[PDB]
Amino acid sequence: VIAQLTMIAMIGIAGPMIIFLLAVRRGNL
Amino acid sequence: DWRVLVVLLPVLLAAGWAVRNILPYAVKQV
Amino acid sequence: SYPIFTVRWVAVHTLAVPTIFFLGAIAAMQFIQR
Amino acid sequence: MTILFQLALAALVILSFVMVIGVPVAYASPQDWDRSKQLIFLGSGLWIALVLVVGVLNFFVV
Amino acid sequence: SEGGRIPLWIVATVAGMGVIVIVGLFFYGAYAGLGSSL
Amino acid sequence: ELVNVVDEKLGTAYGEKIDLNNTNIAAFIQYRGLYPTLAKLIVKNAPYESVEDVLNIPGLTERQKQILRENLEHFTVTEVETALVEGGDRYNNGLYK
Amino acid sequence: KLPEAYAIFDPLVDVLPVIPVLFLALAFVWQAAVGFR
Amino acid sequence: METLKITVYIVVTFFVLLFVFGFLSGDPARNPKRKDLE
Amino acid sequence: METITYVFIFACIIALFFFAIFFREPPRIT
Amino acid sequence: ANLWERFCNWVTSTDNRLYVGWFGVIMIPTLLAATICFVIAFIAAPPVDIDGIREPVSGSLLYGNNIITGAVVPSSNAIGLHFYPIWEAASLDEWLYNGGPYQLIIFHFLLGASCYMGRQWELSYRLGMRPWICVAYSAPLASAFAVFLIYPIGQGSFSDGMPLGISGTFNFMIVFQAEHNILMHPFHQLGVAGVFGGALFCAMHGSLVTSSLIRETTETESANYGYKFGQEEETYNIVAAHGYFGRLIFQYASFNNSRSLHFFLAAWPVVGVWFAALGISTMAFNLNGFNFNHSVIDAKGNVINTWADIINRANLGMEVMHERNAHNFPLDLA
Amino acid sequence: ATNRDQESSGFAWWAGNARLINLSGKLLGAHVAHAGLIVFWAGAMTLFELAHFIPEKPMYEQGLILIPHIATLGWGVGPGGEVVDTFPFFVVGVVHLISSAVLGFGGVYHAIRGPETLEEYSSFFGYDWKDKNKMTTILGFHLIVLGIGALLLVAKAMFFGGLYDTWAPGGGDVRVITNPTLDPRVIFGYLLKSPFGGEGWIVSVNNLEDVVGGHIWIGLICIAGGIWHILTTPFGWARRAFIWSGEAYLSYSLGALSMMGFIATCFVWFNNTVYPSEFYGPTGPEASQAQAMTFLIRDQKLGANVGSAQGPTGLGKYLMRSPTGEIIFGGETMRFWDFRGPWLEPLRGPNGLDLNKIKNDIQPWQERRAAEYMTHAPLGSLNSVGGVATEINSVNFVSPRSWLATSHFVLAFFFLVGHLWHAGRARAAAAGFEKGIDRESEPVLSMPSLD
Amino acid sequence: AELTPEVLTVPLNSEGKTITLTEKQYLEGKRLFQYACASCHVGGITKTNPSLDLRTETLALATPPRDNIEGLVDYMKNPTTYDGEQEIAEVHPSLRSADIFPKMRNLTEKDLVAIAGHILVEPKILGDKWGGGKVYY
Amino acid sequence: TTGERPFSDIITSVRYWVIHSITIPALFIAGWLFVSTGLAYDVFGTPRPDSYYAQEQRSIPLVTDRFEAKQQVETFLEQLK
Ligand code: CLA
Ligand code: CLA
Ligand code: CLA
Ligand code: CLA
Ligand code: CLA
Ligand SMILES: CC1=C(/C=C/C(C)=C/C=C/C(C)=C/C=C/C=C(C)/C=C/C=C(C)/C=C/C2=C(C)CCCC2(C)C)C(C)(C)CCC1
Ligand SMILES: CC1=C(/C=C/C(C)=C/C=C/C(C)=C/C=C/C=C(C)/C=C/C=C(C)/C=C/C2=C(C)CCCC2(C)C)C(C)(C)CCC1
Ligand SMILES: CC1=C(/C=C/C(C)=C/C=C/C(C)=C/C=C/C=C(C)/C=C/C=C(C)/C=C/C2=C(C)CCCC2(C)C)C(C)(C)CCC1
Ligand SMILES: CCCCCCCCCCCCO[C@@H]1O[C@H](CO)[C@@H](O[C@H]2O[C@H](CO)[C@@H](O)[C@H](O)[C@H]2O)[C@H](O)[C@H]1O
Ligand SMILES: CCCCCCCS[C@@H]1O[C@H](CO)[C@@H](O)[C@H](O)[C@H]1O
Ligand code: OEX
Ligand SMILES: [Ca+2]
Ligand SMILES: [Ca+2]
Ligand SMILES: [Cl-]
Ligand SMILES: [Cl-]
Ligand SMILES: [Cl-]
Ligand SMILES: [Mg+2]
């Protein structure tokens, strides 16, 4: 019941992570 | 009652904290 | 240039402070068992 | 054999995560598109490969 | 400190996720403990 | 002069015991051993001029007769009431829980 | 249930079906990042 | 009844045909601006 | 008399629809 | 021009006092039929065996009803969802006993109103308007479909469609509450927010525009004469209204954009009522309101009632009393 | 950043995707990525269902909607719909998820990396919305693809194990369809049935032969039509009837999808042939009927003569006549006499329910099925409390039929709304007043007064 | 009020021997009853035959007595009509008919005991509600 | 504007978050303990799951006298031993 929260943390961050990486490196957002 | 101090210790520690951090601007304003 | 402790500040906090405390309480309640 | 399956599946999941964050950031990146394109090709072939490997080893651990 | 340092889109995303988390907790509580009918 | 016949029957032995001639079959659940076998036989072979005639139902086992004898004190008989026995109401009287 | 071998991934499987929804939410994070222009 | 039925069937068919052919009769062009929509 | 009354009020209302629509004071632009 | 050309030209004419149009070609006869049948039935139709148990209910004025109690009564439960046109009955007397007038009226009406929506699109097009008034109208129309068509389909009988009458409408509501707990359904709740809110904003908007009417008249005449039809100037000061409202709450809670504002005025009640309609339409398939009956339990296991349980008692009263001679088996399964 | 703010594109962020109307490469991206979302949900949801699946519980007791779809196709189930091997479910899920990774890949590629427009790139893959020939060509392509799909169902039914047949003699079982109904009289006969009670239009299809034959027909019609639209261009009357633009086409497809959603709603609510009650639970009609059956059995066991038992209203308490005479179940379920199901038909004779068969031929499996279906009626609360609205908490149940019906009614409705929106907008834009009225050319000002 | 060991002490057999269930046993029992039984027996009534409920007094007057653990376990193995005269496994879920009532398949002896205990304890909590039906809701 | 600093400014400033990343969780924890310590029950007079009824009683402690209501509630509370 812990790994559900861990995985949804990794996935759930995976989304905003892309946006952040691109915004930092001034990518084509 | 001990539960009152246990419960209202975080509140007053937060109050003391922000008071400490905002004191100079507060004095400057007042 | 900007003040900190305005009427707006008071209003905002009379609402915001209790709200967070109450939310902490309700959170705790989610683990109460009969 | 079970160890191979478990390796292949763990690798599959990890590579998948890496690709999920990586391919869009790469596509939208101005710099270093050449090596990145290389890496996307690489990771793609390895992704396909890993899927086929988990697929095969499935019937030898189930 | 200066205003504008922390991007508003990050504040929004973080806040939003926090809301989803607390509400998610509350819906979890509908099935567990008090109020669960069990 | 106008009378509710069901209310009237409630003031007879019908309001006191299982009426072998009228009562709905579910009543036989009140006592050990009567439902469903004996209840079905009883309602089927109604009406009865007296309670002990219930013992004269053809085909009864000795066990069955013993159970009936054990429960005659809980039985009665009154005139068949059309209102209570039409519409198959002795098998289903529109009452559930 | 899943075949025994894959049991380790049970929590992951519990979370996957909601991932499409995340995409809709992502569209907004993205828009906020370019100021809803 | 049968006469009533046939009557109604004829009426309904008539009006439905009116509707369909009516909308087939260059409707995009029946507006106050750009009538060239073909 | 009740029925007559109900139908009469209704009928008046329909008549009123007729006049309010076809015998309205025409809107005019200035 | 030929005859059909002339005809199309008149039908679609922007000069007709009432616009006809191709949707109108279907609308006018179906609505006239529904209207005529409804008035005649409401006045003079005999009792109708709504629940198909030879227990005819009187709906018309001549058969003991007033405006409040009267109704055109839904077709017989024995008919179910069967198509029951006049020519399917052996006679008018049969047709009336079995509630044919109802099916004639609701089908003609649903068609007619659908065409009313279309017609709204059409005239908007002919006049060079934007097209979405008809979309606002889709909300009440969808509701009508919900209570007249969809719910009967879901429950398997037009006998459970809403009656064409005031008290009968109330019958529908009470029974609905008993069988679906509609009050505890978030879509009905969104519908209430839709109409309460629509009323609120109607009053709000009316009052704000009225408050900031520019002085154009004397005290001894209606302020309304200060506006002339077709004038190019806006007749109220929207900056004054916004200064007011913005100070009533706070600035950024208020609209300064009239387009945005009016869009809001359209969107809120329309959306709310869309959800009300969807509430009826999905409770049509017995997905019901939240059931928290016996949800709170103490340490021993004693049930602790909430207001939800009191609601449940009321619902029980409704349930056991409704259609008191129609159930033979213990579960009301439709 | 071409067309990616309001000033350049004309569209605000909330109408953002409208910026893709003439950016066919990026639009291709959006579409393929979305297809990836769909295939993703199929896979993921399937694996999820399987993980939560207890094979000895009925599917419909477990909130399953996809595994029932897989089982209806013959995979994983044996006689009576018993789950005999879950592996095909696993396969279907895994493969869908894996494929969703590919579709996602292509979608993201075309969406933010590949050519933004496809016309300069390829004259084959590029298109102009106004180009009726190309439009009908793409339409043709996809028609052929659909016809192929329908033919895949046909092939599964006839050559690869068959389908689950709830009507199979001796009980429900997977069966190979060898003699599909090919007669056009039957196939299109369905299409001309009234949608009203006791008729049910195409929703009334009640044997697999008709299903398979219908899909044969639909496959050939689709491939033929697809070829037809590749090879032709719209005729004159067609040209004069329609609005030819991206938004218009979108509106048309939205209308079609609305229609289909409503149709699916009725299908899952009434039909128990392609939605076997073994997997999806009993239909509403079915469960009501099943209650009638249940208490007829109980009371007849107690010695009741169910054929002559007069209920309180004067109608039979257990049995009565339909308006055309057939013997049917009594009480409220009189509305549901059009119901047909494998557990009830053995009691049916030429004149309807048969009293002799009812007295003498009711098997224990029939009693069982009736009790099961009676006690799993598609009634339940939004938080999944099974039963009537006044039932107390204890049973966690809402029928898959309710879930599917309601979901698709909502989706169909909002899609009808979408069609109105985009049809009206398409007309207004093609005619040139979608952005408002020209003050210097206000049409009504050039019209005569109404009065 | 609490779920005490006394509340959890119920008749094991007809001879007046009792057994005291654990709270885990009580919980397992409610769970298993919901899993295999509530579809017809929610609240202690019987939806497909309301004349027979699961109230302790009713079970007591059944033949053989079903107001104790042995009786209930046996019923779950070889169910009879109320008078004991007929065996009804063909139309009532049981281990004996776990082939046609598939949910009965994965039920262990331990499980049957838990279900039985639930049937016996619940009326001690809910009172007239148990077997009461909507009147007592 | 009305004088006050824009909210965007404030809630995207480093100092704001330095303060509130302390003050917000402190409050949250305080409410959490207000419940978890059980203090809430006793401040507001709310029954714990074991304090609605005495063990065998099944009658609601309904207040029935206006002016001696306090004594009544206190009696009802004593009745839980
Ligand atoms: C089904 C959901 C969906 C899809 C497929 C799209 C697709 C698109 N949108 Mg739309 N949009 C959507 C919903 C969607 N949108 C919603 C809900 C909104 C309201 C917030 C919008 C509002 C909107 C606006 C205002 C605009 C678009 C635009 C676009 C296009 C270009 C986006 C871009 O280049 O930004 C670049 C973004 C990035 C580079 C950040 C990363 C984005 C990628 C796709 C994330 C990939 C994540 C994924 C997990 C990776 C898996 C990799 C793996 C396979 C290896 C693209 C075709 C733009 C357009 O039309 O341009 C002409 C545009 O201006 N959208
Ligand atoms: C066709 C669509 C569909 C249908 C019929 C179902 C049906 C079901 N799902 Mg599934 N599912 C779906 C899509 C669907 N789902 C999607 C999109 C996801 C990803 C989020 C999932 C992920 C999922 C999980 C993880 C689980 C289920 C489960 C279930 C079962 C319990 C449902 C429940 O309690 O809902 C609760 C009801 C709601 C939350 C109400 C939703 C109301 C929506 C939000 C309103 C939308 C209105 C409209 C679209 C908005 C338009 C805006 C307007 C302005 C125009 C039920 C069989 C459960 C199960 O039992 O598995 C075995 C379960 O655990 N589903
Ligand atoms: C599904 C719709 C679709 C359409 C219309 C296109 C169209 C295009 N793609 Mg794209 N793309 C797609 C999906 C699509 N793609 C997918 C799913 C992926 C991930 C694999 C990609 C990844 C991709 C890349 C990396 C590139 C393209 C390129 C192109 C362009 C050149 C293609 C070509 O000439 O190949 C010729 C065609 C063949 C050699 C035959 C293909 C054989 C197929 C794969 C067999 C399977 C057929 C079967 C029907 C598939 C069923 C799938 C279904 C069940 C979901 C063309 C505009 C190129 C481009 O844009 O250049 C700038 C390019 O570099 N695509
Ligand atoms: C187009 C007509 C059509 C119809 C009526 C059906 C009906 C059915 N399909 Mg089939 N199928 C079709 C085409 C169709 N299918 C196609 C094109 C494919 C390939 C994608 C399939 C692949 C398929 C599979 C794999 C399965 C089915 C299954 C089924 C059954 C259950 C699913 C369902 O409820 O669909 C309801 C159908 C609809 C809602 C579509 C209605 C279409 C309307 C009548 C016409 C729309 C035309 C359009 C709006 C206008 C055209 C424009 C032109 C006139 C100018 C049901 C009998 C399942 C089954 O049979 O289990 C044994 C199943 O497993 N279908
Ligand atoms: C996605 C499916 C699809 C779509 C969108 C189209 C679209 C088109 N087709 Mg094509 N076609 C298709 C598949 C499709 N086709 C298939 C599968 C075949 C083989 C059967 C054909 C055979 C075909 C021929 C022979 C012709 C077309 C033509 C056309 C064009 C005009 C059609 C039109 O005005 O429809 C609107 C429909 C009508 C005007 C028909 C009468 C209108 C009444 C009111 C329809 C009532 C139906 C009713 C509501 C449905 C309820 C159920 C019913 C069965 C009882 C249009 C581009 C025409 C064209 O221009 O070719 C280039 C043309 O001559 N199609
Ligand atoms: C299958 C799989 C996978 C995949 C994954 C994926 C595909 C993922 C994705 C993911 C994603 C895709 C994510 C996303 C997320 C998102 C989010 C999390 C968001 C949120 C949002 C929000 C919160 C919002 C907010 C806001 C804004 C921004 C503005 C306005 C306001 C508001 C508040 C609304 C992997 C690799 C793991 C491996 C295993 C299996
Ligand atoms: C364009 C765009 C967009 C969208 C996008 C999208 C929508 C995408 C999609 C994508 C996708 C659609 C993706 C997918 C992916 C997937 C994956 C990545 C998967 C993987 C898988 C795996 C890894 C598996 C595994 C396994 C196995 C094999 C066995 C069993 C178990 C398990 C599950 C573990 C947006 C809105 C954002 C905005 C911008 C633009
Ligand atoms: C598979 C199957 C089957 C079959 C199916 C089929 C064979 C179908 C067909 C279908 C069809 C065959 C359909 C059709 C449709 C059509 C439509 C839907 C139409 C539409 C139209 C429109 C929309 C038009 C409009 C208009 C007008 C009216 C006027 C002028 C203008 C316009 C053009 C706009 C069966 C049942 C046997 C069985 C099951 C399986
Ligand atoms: C019940 C379903 C019926 C389905 C019928 C399917 C028919 C398919 C072929 C349709 C042929 C359309 O034929 C259509 O009618 C007449 C024929 O003189 C034409 O006539 C129209 O011309 C112009 C067009 O600007 C109009 O202003 C004018 O009012 C009208 O006379 C239409 O322009 C033509 O497109
Ligand atoms: C498009 C993917 C196709 C995957 C392969 C499907 C094999 S289908 C396979 O065929 C057998 C008869 O030939 C059946 O007996 C069996 O039940 C069935 O699953
Ligand atoms: O019909 Mn009118 O109401 Ca719908 O539930 Mn069943 O049925 Mn009757 O009872 Mn309840
Ligand atoms: Ca405890
Ligand atoms: Ca072509
Ligand atoms: Cl009523
Ligand atoms: Cl009934
Ligand atoms: Cl009783
Ligand atoms: Mg809880």
Tell me the domains of chain K and their CATH numbers: 1-281+378-451 (no CATH), 282-377 (1.10.10.670)
DSSP letter at L64 equals S
* C-M Cβ pairs (cutoff 8 Å, strict): 52
In this structure, chain A runs to a length of: 29
Question: Residue F29: phi, psi to the nearest 5?
Answer: -75, -15
**Bind-site residues of K for chlorophyll a:** 13, 27, 30, 92, 106, 138, 211, 225, 404, 415, 418
* Listed residue (J162, J179, J180, J184) closest to J171, CA to CA: J162
- In B, minimum Cα distance to M15 occurs at B21
Of K66, K73, K32, the C-alpha closest to K52 is K66
Q: With an 8 Å Cβ cutoff, are K430 and H38 in contact?
A: no
L137 part of contact set with chain K, CB < 8 Å: yes
User: ∠ at Cα M13 (M11, M19), nearest 5°?
Assistant: 80
Q: Which of K144, K151, K204, K229 to mutate to test the pocket of ligand 5 (most atoms within 8 A of CB)?
A: K229
H4 in contact with chain K, both atoms CB, cutoff 8 A: no
Cβ neighbors of K99 (< 8 A, separation 6 or more) are K39, K43
What is the Cα–Cα distance from K268 to K96, expressed in whole angstroms? 23
Dist. CA J47–CA J55, nearest whole Å: 9
CA distance K268 to K408: 10
b or e along J9-29 (b: 16 or more beta carbons within 10 Å of the residue's beta carbon)? eebbebeeeebbbbbbbbbbb
Q: What DSSP designation does L97 have?
A: T
Distance, CA of D8 to CA of F62 (rounded, Å) = 76
Q: Which ligand is nearest to the CA of K231?
A: 13
DSSP per residue over L47-60, as a string?
Answer: TT-TTS---HHHHH
Residues at CB less than 6 angstroms from ligand 4: K 72-73, 146, 149-150, 153, 163, 202, 205, 211, 215, 218, 222, 256, 259-260, 263-264, 267, 274
Q: Find out whether K287 and K378 touch, Cβ atoms under 8 Å.
A: yes
Closest alpha carbon to L75 in L95, L55, L58: L95
* E27 interaction partners in chain K (CB closer than 8 Å): none
Q: Which residues contact K245 (CB under 8 A, 6 or more apart)?
A: K129, K130, K426, K429, K430
- Cα–Cα distance measured from residue J219 to residue J52, given in angstroms and rounded to the nearest whole number: 65
**Pairing mode of beta strands J287-288, K380-381:** parallel
Of residues G5, G9, G12, nearest to D62 (C-beta): G5
Q: What is the resolution of this structure in A?
A: 2.3
Pick out the residues of the known binding site of C for heme: 13
Cα gap K109→K28, rounded to integer Å: 10
Element (H, E) at K406: helix K400-431
Chains L and J physically touch (3 or more Cβ atom pairs below 8 Å): yes
Question: Is K32 touching ligand 3 by the criterion CB < 6 Å?
Answer: yes
The rounded distance, in Å, linking the Cα atoms of J152 and J150 is: 5
Contact M76, M59 (CB under 8 A): no
Contacts of A9 (CB under 8 A, 6+ apart): none
Q: Which residues touch K179 (CB under 8 Å, ≥6 apart)?
A: K209
K388 close to J175: Cβ distance less than 8 angstroms: no
CA nearest to F56, candidates F20, F24, F88, F32: F20
Domain spans of chain D? 1-62
Q: Which of K165, K248, K240, K200 is nearest to K424 (CA)?
A: K248
Q: Is L83 on the interface with F (CB under 8 A)?
A: yes
Q: How far is CA H16 from the centre of its chain?
A: 5
Please list every residue in chain J whose beta carbon sits closer than 8 Å to the beta carbon of residue H2.
87
Write the CA distances from E6 to B25, G28, L34, M17, M69, integer angstroms: 21, 18, 52, 9, 57
Which amino acid makes up residue M11? I
Asked whether L136 and L128 are in contact (CB, 8 A), the reply is yes
Nearest to G12 among A1, A2, A7 (CB): A7
Distance CA D55, CA K94 (A): 10
Are F20 and F75 in contact by the 8 Å Cβ rule? The answer is yes
Ligand closest to Cα of K27 equals 1
Residue F73 DSSP SS3: helix
Q: How many residues does chain E have?
A: 38
J vs K, Cβ pairs < 8 A, gives 227
Question: What residues contact F5, with CB distance under 8 A and at least 6 apart?
Answer: F81, F83
- Between CA L23 and CA L25 the distance in angstroms is 5
Cβ of residue M8 closer than 8 Å to a chain J Cβ: no
Give me the residues of M, 29-58, that contact E with CB < 8 A.
Answer: 49
Tell how far the Cα of K225 is from the centroid of ligand 5, in angstroms. 9
Q: Which residue has the tokens 């149009």?
A: J21
Topology adopted by domain D1-62: Helix Hairpins (1.10.287)
Comparing C-alpha atoms, which of F37, F32, F70 is closest to residue F51? Answer: F70
d(CA L133, CA J3): 73
Ligand sitting nearest the alpha carbon of K143: 5
- CB pair distance less than 8 Å for J330 and F94: no
**Contact partners, residue K97, CB within 8 Å, separation at least 6:** G16, K39, K40, K43, K44, K47
Q: List the single residue in K199, K381, K437 with the smallest CB-CB distance to J288.
A: K381
* C-beta atoms surrounding K99 within 10 Å: 16
Query: What residues contact residue K379 under an 8 Å CB cut-off, 6+ apart?
Result: J286, J288, J333, K386, K387, K388, K389, K399, K402
The tally of domains found in chain L comes to 1
Please identify, by atom number, the ligand 3 atom nearest to the C-alpha of residue K122.
57
Q: Which residues of E touch C30 (CB under 8 A)?
A: 25-26, 28-29, 32-33
CB within 8 Å: K303 and F87? no
Q: How far is it, in rounded angstroms, from Cα J266 to Cα J201?
A: 10
Range of the domain at L41: 1-137
Q: Which of G19, G23, G36 sits opposite K13 (nearest CB)?
A: G36
Say whether J232 counts as a known binding-site residue: no
* Burial state string for L121-132 with b = 16 or more CB within 10 A and e = fewer than 16: bbbbbbeebbbb
- State the amino acid at position L27 in one-letter form: L
Q: Indicate if the alpha-carbon torsion angle K328, K332, K338, K342 is positive or negative.
A: negative
Q: How far apart are CA F22 and CA F42, in angstroms?
A: 11
Q: What is the Cα–Cα distance from K92 to A20, expressed in whole angstroms?
A: 35
* Exp. method: X-ray
Lookup result for tokens 């994965």: L106
If DSSP codes are grouped into helix, strand and coil, which group holds residue K348?
Answer: strand
CA atoms within 13 A on the CB side of E11: 16
Chain I residues whose CB is inside 8 A of the J43 CB are 3, 7
Domains, chain M, ordered by start: 1-81 (1.20.5.860)
Stretch (H or E) spanning J164: strand J164-165
Closest CA to D44 of D26, D61, D57: D26
- Chains G and H are in contact, defined as 3 or more C-beta pairs closer than 8 angstroms: no
Instruction: Determine if residue J28 is left, alpha or beta; phi over 0 gives left, psi from -120 to 50 gives alpha, anything else beta.
Output: alpha
Our CA dihedral for J176, J180, J182, J187, rounded to 10 degrees, sits at -120
* Residue L41, marked binder: yes
Contact C5 B26 (CB under 8 A): yes
Which tokens belong to K82?
């018993």
Is the CB of residue J313 less than 8 Å from the CB of residue L137? yes
On whether the CB atoms of residues L103 and K376 are closer than 8 A, the answer is no
Question: What CA–CA distance (Å, rounded) separates K142 from K127?
Answer: 15
Search chain K and give the residue with CA nearest J19.
K450
User: Mutate which of K83, K84, K160 to test ligand 10's pocket (most atoms within 8 Å of Cβ)?
Assistant: K160
CA H38 from centroid of its chain's CA atoms: 20
Cis peptide before J163 (omega within 30 of 0): no
Nearest CA to ligand 7 atom 14: K101
Residue F80 and residue F23 in contact, taking contact as beta carbons nearer than 8 Å:
no
Ligand nearest to the CA of K149: 4
Which atom of ligand 6 is nearest the CA belonging to D13? 38
Q: Give the whole-angstrom CA distance, residue J204 versus residue J245.
A: 10
Q: Name the residue with tokens 């609205």.
A: K389
Element counts in chain H: helices (H) and strands (E): 1, 0
Determine the atom of ligand 11 nearest the C-alpha atom of J319. Answer: 10
In angstroms, what separates the C-alpha of C28 from chain J's closest C-alpha? Answer: 17
Chain CA centroid to CA K57, Å: 25
Using CB atoms, which chains have 3+ pairs under 8 A with J? C, E, F, H, I, K, L, M
- CA nearest to K423, candidates J11, J134, J271, H29: J134
Distance (Å, whole) CA J172 – CA J157: 14
* Spatial CA neighbour of K186 closest among K163, K217, K159, K162: K217
- Asked if residues K131 and K41 have their Cβ atoms less than 8 Å apart, the reply is no
Pocket lining: K125 vs ligand 10, CB cutoff 6 Å: no
Question: Annotated binding residue at L91?
Answer: no
- J319/chain F closest Cα distance in angstroms: 14
| Residues J173/J279, Cβ–Cβ less than 8 Å | no
Spell out the residues 6+ positions from residue A7 whose beta carbon is closer than 8 angstroms to its own.
G11, G12, G15
Distance to chain J for E33, nearest Cα, Å:
9
In angstroms, what is the C-alpha Rg of chain C?
A: 15
Phi, psi of J288, deg, nearest 5: -105, -175
Q: How far does residue K288's CA lie from ligand 15's centre (Å)? A: 8
Q: What is the CA M78 to chain-centroid distance, rounded?
A: 23
I6 burial level (CB within 10 Å; 0-12, 13-18, 19+): middle
CB L118 within 8 A of CB L125: no
- Tokens for M5, please give them: 């600093």
Q: Any CB–CB contact under 8 A between K108 and chain D?
A: yes
Backbone angles phi, psi at K173, to 5 degrees: -165, 155
Q: Which CATH architecture has domain F1-86?
A: Orthogonal Bundle (1.10)
For residue D14, count CB atoms less than 10 angstroms from its CB and return exposed for 0-12, middle for 13-18, buried for 19 or more.
exposed
> Using the beta-carbon criterion (under 8 Å), do M38 and B3 form an inter-chain contact?
yes
Smallest CA-to-CA distance from K263 within K70, K409, K399, K407 is with K409
Closest CA to J127 of K419, H35, K447, H19: K447
Determine whether the interchain pair M55/L1 forms a contact, defined as Cβ–Cβ distance below 8 Å. yes
Angle between helices J307-321 and J166-180 (to 10 degrees): 120
Residue ranges of domains in chain F: 1-86
Three-state secondary structure call for residue M56: coil
Peptide bond preceding L64 in cis form (omega within 30 of 0)? yes
Q: K313 and J134 in contact (C-beta within 8 Å)?
A: no
* Other CB atoms within 10 Å distance of the CB of residue M52: 19
